[PDB]
Structure formats: structure tokens, C-alpha cells
């Protein structure tokens, strides 16, 4: 299946790149200092966990910003290659007000701003922190969405070569790859 994007109508006239830069700044680490993948309130984590899940969720330590990575994800912890997030990445949901968990039937964003589905990413454990899945998700807590964008831009062009991360959400809806959600 082709990339599918949901967006709050608030972002209709914004480019994907613009929104991602804004959300990155909201998450609060645009100087790329290394974090350890856990928020200060243990609001996120793996579902079902403890170190593997169909979801990996993380809240910012600087703001209410949060994301949920969806697929079939694995964290190596101290096992070689250490501190690697690998496996299948199907989706990224961005917004704020992270809630839920294993006990709640999954993580959710009370304010889901934008989501990217059918990303079709798979990284094996052997690639360690060089894996695309690791780089894409690590970028979302480390202020650098370039790996996610390489993947979104590539997926958009696979559908239509006139699309890019510089397309507005409304332009992507007109091209059949995005749909608006309530503000």
C-alpha cells in the first residue's frame, strides 16, 4: 500500500517540511544533544513491552510534544548492538498529550496533529544504529527529521513525481495520498 497521511485541517496550507520543522522545535532538541529514549514521567514506552512492541511512544522532556512509532519494533538495550531500535516501522503519529499504554489498548495522542502510515520501513538488528528505522525514530527525539523526510519524499515520489515534502497537506490530499481530520 502507498503512503497515507492524516493531518488536522489547521495544517492544510502548510508544507510537510514546514510542519515537521515546527513539530521538531516543539519537541525541543533542535541542537541534537543525545537523549536515552525515555521521558521523565515514563508516559511512553513499548506496547506491550517491556522492550518490544507494536508501538513505541515518547513524550518530550521540554514540552507536551509526543510521537508514536507503529509497526513491529525491538530495542536491544545493552545487547550488541546496544541501544538499537530495529524492526518494522509502518507509521509515525506526531502531536501532543500522549496517553494510554498496554493496559489501555494502546498509546494515543489526545491531540494527533499529523500521521504518516504505510512507511514500509524494515531494518535488521545487524545494522545497529545505522538502520533506517533507528535513524528515522531517533531523529524525532533529537531534532533532525531528515531520515523520516528522505523516506516520506521517496514514498510521495513513488506515487507522483510532482509531490515532495515541499507539497502542502491540501496538495497531497488533491493527489490522493493525504486526508484532513478535525482541528
Amino acid at each position: 500500500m502507498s503512503i497515507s497521511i492524516s493531518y488536522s485541517t489547521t495544517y492544510s496550507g502548510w508544507t510537510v517540511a514546514d510542519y515537521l520543522a515546527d513539530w521538531s522545535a516543539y519537541f525541543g532538541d533542535v541542537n541534537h544533544r543525545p537523549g536515552q529514549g525515555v521521558d521523565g514521567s515514563n508516559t511512553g514506552g513499548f506496547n506491550p513491552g517491556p522492550f518490544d512492541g507494536s508501538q513505541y511512544a515518547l513524550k518530550s522532556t521540554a514540552s507536551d510534544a509526543a510521537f508514536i512509532a507503529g509497526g513491529d519494533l525491538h530495542y536491544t538495550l545493552f545487547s550488541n548492538p546496544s541501544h538499537t531500535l530495529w524492526g518494522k516501522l509502518d507509521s509515525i503519529a506526531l502531536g501532543d498529550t500522549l496517553t494510554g499504554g498496554a493496559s489501555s489498548g494502546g498509546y494515543a495522542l489526545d491531540s494527533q496533529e499529523v500521521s504518516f502510515s504505510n512507511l514500509g520501513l524494515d531494518s535488521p538488528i545487524a545494522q545497529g544504529r545505522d538502520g533506517t528505522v533507528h535513524k528515522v525514530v531517533y531523529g524525532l527525539m533529537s531534532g533532525d527529521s531528515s531520515a523520516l523526510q528522505g523516506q516520506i519524499d521517496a514514498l510521495l515520489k513513488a506515487v507522483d513525481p510532482s509531490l515532495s515534502i515541499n507539497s502542502t497537506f491540501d496538495q497531497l490530499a488533491a493527489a490522493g495520498v493525504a486526508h484532513a481530520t478535525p482541528a
Side-chain angles (χ1 to χ4, degrees), residues 25-29 33 59-65:
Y26 179 30
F27 196 85
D29 193 24
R33 54 195 188 277
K59 177 187 179 302
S60 170
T61 58
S63 74
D64 197 52

Side-chain angles (χ1 to χ4, degrees), residues 121 131-137 139 144-152:
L121 293 168
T132 301
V133 165
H134 184 102
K135 290 282 185 189
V136 164
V137 181
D144 173 2
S145 66
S146 70
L148 175 56
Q149 291 192 227
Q151 304 307 317
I152 295 166

